[PDB]
Amino acid sequence: EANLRLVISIAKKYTNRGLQFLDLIQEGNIGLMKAVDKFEYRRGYKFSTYATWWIRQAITRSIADQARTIRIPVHMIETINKLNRISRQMLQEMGREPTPEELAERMLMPED
DNA sequence: ACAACCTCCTTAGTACATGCAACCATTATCACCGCCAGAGGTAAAATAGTCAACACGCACGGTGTTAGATATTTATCCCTTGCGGTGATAGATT
């Protein structure tokens, strides 16, 4: 209850058309349960930082592989999104259309 | 005591029919990297084998000659033309 607002200010970032303007807040409100259970204030650190790690990634996963058509081990989910993040160079440095042939040097790896 | 009635309140339930043409994108979001699985790698030997050696041995294809077929040439024959003589049709009657 004391943290229900911090769940909005983190979650609402990700609700940006992502799947809906709403639902990620309520999944953050369940990530907050694991956070409240493992709240090691006995290290010294603050619940702001706790939320910035754990509750943020509960908010991320709430529509990463949850609510999709498809779901995989998570390294192989967000790696598809590493490529979309890298494409921000491609679309302006090769800079007319995207080319997997450029992505091969930007990943140092074979396409297949 | 209730009853519906005066007024504009808002709510929200629908919006006819047949057909053809077009192509299928946008998001970001640390997945972290730690562990170890059976599990990737590969050495040495099972399930068994390569292809080079020297033999083996054969088929196929091209060069040569032969064969006979075919398309020409020739000339014959028939079926056809066009006109003509005169046909019994068309059909009205018996």
Swiss-Prot record:
Places the protein is found: Cytoplasm
Motif Interaction with polymerase core subunit RpoC, chain ranges: 23-26
Stretches for region Sigma-70 factor domain-2: 1-69
Top-rank taxon, per record: Bacteria
Family in the record: Belongs to the sigma-70 factor family. RpoD/SigA subfamily.
Chain's role: Sigma factors are initiation factors that promote the attachment of RNA polymerase to specific initiation sites and are then released. This sigma factor is the primary sigma factor during exponential growth. Preferentially transcribes genes associated with fast growth, such as ribosomal operons, other protein-synthesis related genes, rRNA- and tRNA-encoding genes and prfB.
Domain topic, free-text comment: Contains 4 domains, connected by flexible linkers. In the active conformation, the domains are in an extended conformation, each making extensive interactions with the RNA polymerase catalytic core. In the autoinhibited state, sigma-70 factor domain-1 packs closely together with sigma-70 factor domains-2 and -4, contrary to the extended conformation that is seen when the protein is part of the RNA polymerase holoenzyme.
Subunit structure of this chain's protein: Interacts transiently with the RNA polymerase catalytic core formed by RpoA, RpoB, RpoC and RpoZ (2 alpha, 1 beta, 1 beta' and 1 omega subunit) to form the RNA polymerase holoenzyme that can initiate transcription. Identified in a complex containing RpoD, the RNA polymerase subunits RpoA, RpoB and RpoZ, CRP and DNA. Interacts with Rsd; this prevents interaction with the RNA polymerase catalytic core and with promoter DNA, and as a consequence, promotes transcription from promoters that require alternative sigma factors. (Microbial infection) Interacts with Escherichia phage lambda antitermination protein Q.
Protein name, UniProt field: RNA polymerase sigma factor RpoD
